[PDB]
Design a protein around this ligand. Structure first.
Ligand SMILES: *[C@@H]1O[C@H](CO)[C@@H](O[C@@H]2O[C@H](CO)[C@@H](O[C@@H]3O[C@H](CO[C@H]4O[C@H](CO)[C@@H](O)[C@H](O)[C@@H]4O)[C@@H](O)[C@H](O[C@H]4O[C@H](CO)[C@@H](O)[C@H](O)[C@@H]4O)[C@@H]3O)[C@H](O)[C@H]2NC(C)=O)[C@H](O)[C@H]1NC(C)=O
Ligand SMILES: *[C@@H]1O[C@H](CO)[C@@H](O[C@@H]2O[C@H](CO)[C@@H](O[C@@H]3O[C@H](CO[C@H]4O[C@H](CO)[C@@H](O)[C@H](O)[C@@H]4O)[C@@H](O)[C@H](O[C@H]4O[C@H](CO)[C@@H](O)[C@H](O)[C@@H]4O)[C@@H]3O)[C@H](O)[C@H]2NC(C)=O)[C@H](O)[C@H]1NC(C)=O
Ligand SMILES: *[C@@H]1O[C@H](CO)[C@@H](O[C@@H]2O[C@H](CO)[C@@H](O)[C@H](O)[C@H]2NC(C)=O)[C@H](O)[C@H]1NC(C)=O
Ligand SMILES: *[C@@H]1O[C@H](CO)[C@@H](O[C@@H]2O[C@H](CO)[C@@H](O)[C@H](O)[C@H]2NC(C)=O)[C@H](O)[C@H]1NC(C)=O
Ligand code: NAG
Ligand code: NAG
Ligand code: NAG
Ligand code: NAG
Lengths: 56, 409, 409
C-alpha cells in the first residue's frame, strides 16, 4: 500500500504453469480449474504509526 | 424552525423579542386618592393667561377611581388612563412605587406619559436581587447638589461608565401634562457601540426588581392641593437568556423562565445544564454562541464534574470528567478500562463492553492480569500463546497441573 | 411484576406458559403435488360400499395449492387446510420434512389431524443440535421387526427410561382421514411423577431440531395414485428457561431467547450471568429456586473465580474468590489492605477508601509499611500513635533528627 484504495489484484491461475500452453491436454489442471463453491477468509492486515480510528 | 439553529442547523444565538414590559401589570404604591375620597383642582392656560377648574377622586367611584392598571393598561392617547395619588403632599417624603418581576431581563427603553406637570428632583433605584438590595442608576434635578449632593451634567468617565449623572435638562414645564420621557443609558457612553462585549454595561443593564422615589416639584402662583398623575407606562426589553433561549416560558409552578438552549441551565440560561461540565458556562456572542458542553463518558455515566485547570491546561479545550464512570471504563471521558481489564478493541470507544478482561489460562497463564495493552496473558516458562494455553516449539504438554510444557533436547 | 419472584420478591420458578410451538411457521418438505400440476382421486365410504371421486393439484392454483402454510395455519374445524404430497412413492424411500427452530424447548402436547389415511410404519426423530446430528424418539408400525427391527409396545425400563418403542397402535385405518395420534413422552416412564428431579427425562425432553421420515402406507384397492395428506398440526410447549425466565424475547440480532431472570444467561438460562460463580448454576425447584450466586468483593472487584474444593470444603457454603482487587484491597473478597497501605478501621468494611497508605514516620517509624490492618507504623520507645510521630507522657521532643522524644529521669 499504495494502493490505499482502488487496489488492483488480478490473479491469473494461468501464470507460471509450464504446461499451460497445452491446457486442453492438462486434465489435472482441467481438475485444478474445476470449482463449484468458493470461500474467502482473512485474518491479518498491515499496521502503521505509532479508538482514534475504526479500522475496518 | 428554531432561531437557535440556522438554515444548516448551525447553533446560533436565539433571542426573546423586544416587547414592552410594564404593559398590563400591577404596582403597589405609596398612597392614592379616593381613600377617603379626595379632591384635586386643574388649571388651564388660555392663550397667555390662566383659567382654573377643579375635580375630585373616589376610588369607590370606578370612573373617578384611578387604578394602577391605568399605567399598565393599553392607554389610548385620546382616552388616557391617569392614575392619581392623594393630595396635600410634597418633598420631603418617599414617593415610591413598587415592582417585582421574578425573572431577570434586559431592558432598553423607558418612557413615561404624564397627566401632571414634570417635577424637578427624582431618583432611580434597581434590584439585581429579588427585591432585597437596591442601587440607583441616574439622577435628575436642577439642584443636583442641594438635593442629591451631586453635580449637574456630570461626565461619563471611561474607567467608571457606571456613573450616575444628574441634570436639570428637560425638567422644565411645559410639559405641564403629557410629559415625554426618552432615556437611553447608552448615550454618552463611549463604549456603547458594541454592547456584546460591554459586561460592566451588561451589568449596568442587569436588573431584577426596580424602585423609584420622588421628591421636589414646582409651585407657580403662588390654597393648593399638589399631586402627581400619569397616563401610562411603556418599557421595552427582551427576556434575559444569555442568548441561549429564543424566548421565556412559564414553569409548571407559573414561573416565566428561559427555555434554556445552548446546553444552558438556570431560569436565565446563566449556568450549564447538568453533566454539561466539560467547560464552564458562557453567553452567546455574535461570532460564537459560547455554548455549554456535556462531559464525556462514551456512554458510561449519567453524572460528571468539572475542573477549570483541565480546560486551562488543555490549551483552552476541555475539562469534563465522569461521575460514577461506569461500564468498566475510566477517565474524564470514561475512556479507558480500569485496573484488571483491557480494551475490547473490536468495539468502538463507547461500547458498553468496549473493555475486555483477562480470561487467562488458570493453568497455562501465570495470572489474570494481562497487560491492558495486548491481550497477552501471563505465559509462564517457554510457553507462549494469547491466553497461554498451548505448548510451543520444543514444548510437550504434561498432565502435571503445574508445568505442562517441557523442553526437548 | 415477575412470576420469577414470590409475594415478597422471593425468587420462584418461572416458566413461559404452555403454548403451541409450530403455529404459523414455514416448512420445507421433500415433495408435494402440483409440480408438474398433479391429480388426485378421493374415495368415500357410503354405508358399506365404496365411491371414488377425483380432483387435481396445482400449487399455482391457490385454492388447489396446498402449501406448508396448510400445516401451520390455524386449523378451523370448519375450514381445514389439507396439504398433499406427490404420488407414486412408498417404502423403501425417505419421506422427509424439515423444520428450522432456534430455541431449545421441552414439549408436552403433539396433536395431529389427517386428510389422508393413517399409514402403518413410522418413526420419530429429534436433534439436540442445530441441524447436524439426529436421533430417534419412538417407532410406530405393525411390523416393528421386519420394518423397524423393533419390539412392539416395549416396556419403559427404569434403567433406560429413554426407551424408543414401536407399536402398530393408531397405525390403522379407519381412520382414513382426521386420524388422531395420542403420544405422551411421559407415558411408561417410571420417573415422570417428579420431572424436576428426572434429569434423564430432563434430557429426554431436551430437543432442538426435529426430523420425520415415512416409508410404508396402507394399500387398499386392490391405476390409483397414492399420496400423503394433512390439514394442520398442533404441538404445545413452553420455552426452556430452566425456571429462570418467565418468558422469552428476541435478541438484539432478532433471536427469541429467554429473558433469563435469577441471574442466569444463555438462550435457555443454561448458564449464569457473568460474575455469578460462587455456587454453580442450577434449575429452580419448588423447594429452592437454585439460582446463581456472585462472589463477594466488598465493592472492590468486578471479576472473580471459583474452586470446587472451596465450596466442597465450605460444607457446601461458598467458593467464590475475586480477581484484581482494586482500591489497594486484596483477598478472596478483596477484604484486606495491601503492603504499603493499611485498613481504615473506622471506615466501612466495603468502602472505596477503606485502605490508607502506610504514611510511616521516615524518622519515628522504621519500616515503609505499617499494620495493614491497624496502621501501626514502627513506634519507637516513647513514640505512640498510628504512624508513630508524637512523644508519649513524660517524653520531650528534641531537635535530634533521629531521637526527638526522650523520657524523663
Ligand atoms: C364613591 O363613588 C361611588 C361611585 O360613583 C359612589 O357609589 C355610590 O354607592 C352607593 C352604594 O349604596 C349607591 O347608593 C345607591 O342609591 C340608593 C339611594 O337610596 C334610595 O334608593 C331608592 C332610589 O334609588 C329610594 O327608593 C330609597 O328610599 C333611597 O332613598 C342607596 O340607598 C343604595 O345603597 C344600597 O345599595 C347597596 C348595594 O349597592 C346595599 O348593600 C345597601 O343596602 C345600600 O343601602 C344604592 O346602592 C350610589 O348609587 C352610588 N353613587 C354613584 C354611583 O354615583 C359613592 O357614593 C362614592 N362615595 C363618596 C363618599 O363620594
Ligand atoms: C396451475 O393452476 C392454475 C389455476 O388452476 C392455472 O392458472 C392459470 O394461469 C393462467 C396464466 O397464464 C391463466 O390464463 C389466463 O387465460 C388466458 C387465455 O389465453 C388468452 O390470453 C389473452 C387474455 O389473457 C388473450 O389475448 C389471448 O388471445 C388468449 O385468448 C392466458 O393467455 C392468460 O395468461 C396470460 O398472462 C401472462 C401473465 O400472467 C402473459 O404473460 C401471457 O400472455 C399469458 O397468455 C390469462 O392469465 C388462467 O386463468 C389460470 N387458470 C385458472 C385460474 O384456472 C395454471 O394454468 C395451472 N398450470 C398449468 C401448467 O396449467
Ligand atoms: C424614607 O426612606 C426609606 C424608604 O425609602 C426608609 O428607610 C427606613 O430606614 C429605617 C432605618 O432604621 C428602617 O428601619 C426602615 O425599615 C426603612 N424603611 C423602609 C426601607 O421602607 C425611611 O423610613 C422612609 N421614611 C419614611 C417611611 O417615613
Ligand atoms: C435417505 O436416507 C438418509 C436420510 O434419511 C440420507 O442419508 C445419506 O447417507 C449417505 C451415506 O453415505 C450420505 O452420503 C448422504 O450424504 C446422506 N444424505 C444426506 C445427509 O442428506 C440419504 O441421502 C437419503 N436418500 C435420499 C433422500 O434420496
Ligand atoms: C374611555 O374609556 C372608558 C372605559 O370604560 C369609557 O367608560 C369611556 O366612555 C371612554 N371614553 C370615550 C370618549 O369613549
Ligand atoms: C503488553 O504489550 C505491549 C505491546 O507490545 C508491550 O509493549 C508490553 O511490554 C506488554 N506488557 C505490559 C504493558 O505490561
Ligand atoms: C376457506 O377459506 C378459503 C380462503 O380463500 C376460502 O376460499 C373458502 O371459501 C373457505 N371455505 C368456505 C367453506 O367458505
Ligand atoms: C496490628 O495491631 C495489633 C493490635 O494489637 C497487633 O496485635 C498486631 O500484631 C499488629 N500487626 C498485624 C496484625 O500484622
Amino acid at each position: 500500500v499504495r494502493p490505499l484504495s482502488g487496489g488492483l489484484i488480478a490473479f491469473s491461475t494461468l501464470d507460471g504453469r509450464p504446461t499451460a500452453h497445452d491446457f486442453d491436454n492438462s486434465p489435472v489442471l482441467q481438475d485444478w480449474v474445476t470449482a463449484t463453491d468458493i470461500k474467502v477468509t482473512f485474518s491479518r492486515l498491515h499496521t502503521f504509526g505509532d479508538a482514534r480510528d475504526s479500522y475496518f | 424552525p428554531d432561531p437557535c439553529y440556522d438554515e444548516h442547523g448551525l447553533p446560533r444565538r436565539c433571542i426573546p423579542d423586544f416587547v414592552n414590559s410594564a404593559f398590563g401589570k400591577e404596582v403597589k404604591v405609596s398612597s392614592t386618592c379616593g381613600k377617603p375620597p379626595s379632591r384635586y383642582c386643574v388649571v388651564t392656560e388660555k392663550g397667555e393667561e390662566q383659567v382654573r377648574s377643579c375635580h375630585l377622586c373616589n376610588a369607590s367611584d370606578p370612573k373617578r377611581a384611578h387604578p394602577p392598571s391605568f399605567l399598565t393598561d393599553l392607554n389610548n392617547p385620546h382616552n388616557l388612563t391617569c392614575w392619581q395619588s392623594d393630595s396635600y403632599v410634597q418633598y420631603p417624603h418617599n414617593v415610591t412605587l413598587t415592582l417585582s418581576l421574578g425573572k431577570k431581563f434586559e431592558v432598553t427603553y423607558v418612557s413615561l406619559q404624564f397627566c401632571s406637570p414634570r417635577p424637578e428632583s427624582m431618583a432611580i433605584y434597581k434590584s439585581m436581587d429579588y427585591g432585597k438590595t437596591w442601587v440607583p442608576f441616574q439622577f435628575y434635578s436642577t439642584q443636583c447638589r442641594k438635593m442629591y449632593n451631586k453635580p449637574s451634567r456630570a461626565a461619563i468617565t471611561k474607567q467608571n461608565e457606571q456613573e450616575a449623572i444628574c441634570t436639570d435638562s428637560h425638567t422644565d414645564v411645559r410639559p405641564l401634562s403629557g410629559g415625554l420621557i426618552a432615556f437611553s443609558t447608552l448615550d454618552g457612553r463611549p463604549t456603547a457601540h458594541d454592547f456584546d462585549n460591554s459586561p460592566v454595561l451588561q451589568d449596568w443593564v442587569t436588573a431584577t426588581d426596580i424602585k423609584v422615589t420622588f421628591s421636589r416639584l414646582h409651585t407657580f402662583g403662588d390654597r393648593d392641593s399638589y399631586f402627581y398623575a400619569v397616563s401610562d407606562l411603556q418599557v421595552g426589553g427582551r427576556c434575559k437568556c444569555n442568548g441561549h433561549a429564543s424566548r421565556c416560558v412559564r414553569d409548571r409552578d407559573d414561573n416565566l423562565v428561559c427555555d434554556c438552549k445552548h446546553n444552558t441551565a438556570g431560569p436565565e440560561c446563566d449556568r450549564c445544564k447538568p453533566f454539561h461540565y466539560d467547560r464552564p458556562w458562557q453567553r452567546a456572542t455574535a461570532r460564537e454562541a459560547n455554548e455549554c458542553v456535556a462531559c464525556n463518558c462514551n456512554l458510561h455515566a449519567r453524572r460528571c464534574r468539572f475542573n477549570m485547570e483541565l480546560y486551562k491546561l488543555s490549551g483552552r479545550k476541555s475539562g469534563g470528567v465522569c461521575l460514577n464512570c461506569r461500564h468498566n471504563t475510566a477517565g474524564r471521558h470514561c475512556h479507558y478500562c480500569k485496573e484488571g481489564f483491557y480494551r475490547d478493541l473490536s468495539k468502538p470507544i463507547s461500547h458498553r463492553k468496549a473493555c475486555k478482561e483477562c480470561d487467562c489460562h488458570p493453568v497455562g497463564a501465570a495470572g489474570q492480569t494481562c497487560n491492558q495493552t495486548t491481550g497477552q496473558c501471563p505465559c509462564k516458562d517457554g510457553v507462549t500463546g494469547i491466553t497461554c494455553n498451548r505448548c510451543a516449539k520444543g514444548y510437550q504438554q504434561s498432565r502435571s497441573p503445574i508445568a505442562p510444557c517441557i523442553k526437548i533436547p
